[PDB]
């Protein structure tokens, strides 16, 4: 009886195995655009993905993760609210059964069709497992997806999903360029928070881009053909793999833009 996104094991149950689920800095949150304050002291974010080395794509039973070589400073996130250098380890998405839900963060209670998370770790802690034990260990770049025009830079991801339908399947996924998943603007909101999956560790500086990317209906329909189950098991479509907004508590969301 492991955690997941069903009736019996979904987000309202997680606190029993992971009591931090009711903690002081949980994610995701609703971004109230009228209460977020412009912070002129933040910087421009620096997203340096030209040397990124993707390796593999894995269906982990929750989402699919595109994994990178993080054994050197190749694809790194710096600036904005961050001090130091954060290495890209993996990206994944959260999405819905229908276009009106899927994102984890919300904007004035608006749900997007999906949300991309680019997960990076703070090199001062040496490895990812040490970083997730620190309050400043991870930086997650979050990007909303709306349904409209296709995202050309996403199609290589879409076209490999048939090969990783079920939990525990992986495929070679070399030479994928994550720059093709970014919107034009790097305007963002930021706040201190958590992993949105168990173990829900309070180790994340969240950086959520204001500008969504557009993907096609055909692209997101291919996300919804994945399976939470392993091969040969009763089919459970991989949909609605999002945690809902959590209480903001004693936190301020800051804006990089006026
Ligand atoms: C070294 C320990 C930390 N490990 C322990 C098992 C998962 C946890 C790592 N969690 C993540 O990387 C992880 C984080 C997120 S999220 N939405 O960025 O918090 C999602 C995910 O899979 C959809 C993840 O699993 C790979
Ligand atoms: Zn995520």
Swiss-Prot record:
Outcome following mutation: residue 3 to A: Impaired activity, not rescued by 4-methylimidazole (4-MI)
Residues binding substrate, per UniProt: 196-197
Disulphide bridges, residue numbers: none
Effect of mutating residue 62 to A: Reduced CO(2) hydrase activity, rescued by 4-methylimidazole (4-MI). Reduced proton transfer. Enhanced proton transfer. Enhanced proton transfer capacity
SMART domains given in the database record: Carb_anhydrase
Record note on what altering residue 90 to P does: In OPTB3; in Czechoslovakia
Cofactor: Zn(2+); Co(2+)
Name of the protein in question: Carbonic anhydrase 2
Gene symbol of the encoding locus: CA2
């Amino acid at each position: 009886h492991h955690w997941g996104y069903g009736k019996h094991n979904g987000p309202e149950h997680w606190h029993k195995d992971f009591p931090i689920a009711k903690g002081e800095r949980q994610s995701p949150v609703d971004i109230d655009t009228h209460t977020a304050k412009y912070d002129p002291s933040l910087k421009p974010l620096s997203v340096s993905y030209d040397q990124a080395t993707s390796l593999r794509i894995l269906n982990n039973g929750h989402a699919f993760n595109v994994e990178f070589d993080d054994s050197q400073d190749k694809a790194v996130l710096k600036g904005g609210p961050l001090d130091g250098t954060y290495r890209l380890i993996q990206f994944h998405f959260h999405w819905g059964s229908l276009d009106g839900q899927g994102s984890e963060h919300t904007v004035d209670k608006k749900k997007y069709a999906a949300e991309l998370h680019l997960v990076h770790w703070n090199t001062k802690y040496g490895d990812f497992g040490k970083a997730v034990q620190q309050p400043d260990g991870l930086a997650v770049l979050g990007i909303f997806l709306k349904v409209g025009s296709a995202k050309p830079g996403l199609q290589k991801v879409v076209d490999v999903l048939d090969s990783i339908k079920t939990k525990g399947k992986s495929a070679d996924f070399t030479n994928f360029d994550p720059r093709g998943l970014l919107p034009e603007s790097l305007d963002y909101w930021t706040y201190p928070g958590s992993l949105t999956t168990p173990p829900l560790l309070e180790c994340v500086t969240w950086i959520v881009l204001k500008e969504p990317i557009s993907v096609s209906s055909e692209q997101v329909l291919k996300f919804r053909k994945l399976n939470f189950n392993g091969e040969g098991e009763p089919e459970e479509l991989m949909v609605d793999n999002w945690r809902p907004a959590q209480p903001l508590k004693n936190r301020q969301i800051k804006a990089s833009f006026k």
